[PDB]
Amino acid sequence: AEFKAGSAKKGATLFKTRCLQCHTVEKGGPHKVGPNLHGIFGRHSGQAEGYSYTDANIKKNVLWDENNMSEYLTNPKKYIPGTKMAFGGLKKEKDRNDLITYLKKATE
Numbered sequence: 149a150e151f152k153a154g155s156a157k158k159g160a161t162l163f164k165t166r167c168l169q170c171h172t173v174e175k176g177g178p179h180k181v182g183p184n185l186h187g188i189f190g191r192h193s194g195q196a197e198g199y200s201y202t203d204a205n206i207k208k209n210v211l212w213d214e215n216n217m218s219e220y221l222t223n224p225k226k227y228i229p230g231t232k233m234a235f236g237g238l239k240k241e242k243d244r245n246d247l248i249t250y251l252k253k254a255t256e
């Protein structure tokens with residue numbers, strides 16, 4: 149994938165509609181169904197403390213950046229077979245770009 153910068157404002161509405169039920173982004177926000185996403189960028193998958201990941205997510209051992217995140221959110225199970233993240237995917241390029249723009253800033 150090729151991340152282009154988008155609207156953080158729409159990315160927040162995208163996050164809050166499609167991600168917030170399973171995730172938080174603030175520093176020190178609680179783990180829910182999924183882990184807190186603070187400092188997700190520049191961190192390998194499966195390394196947030198306090199959350200029990202799938203083996204699949206740990207062994208993927210992917211250093212998250214803008215681009216591989218875009219691929220992941222298109223179809224999570226396809227990028228990480230075995231993941232227990234039950235999310236179909238953000239199919240539209242512009243929605244993924246909008247969200248990741250928000251996510252960069254919101255996870256500090």
Ligand code: HEC
Nearest residue numbers: 166167170181182193194196201202205231232233234235
């Ligand atoms: C539950 C109904 C979820 C929804 C909706 C979304 N996510 Fe999720 N996510 C969820 C789980 C249970 C997990 C753990 C996966 C595992 O196999 O252990 C995840 C994982 C992620 C990750 C990876 C984080 C890591 O530390 O490796 C990311 C980046 C992530 N989720 C982001 C994310 C976004 C952006 C969502 C909506 C757009 C979203 N998730 C929805 C559970 C659920």
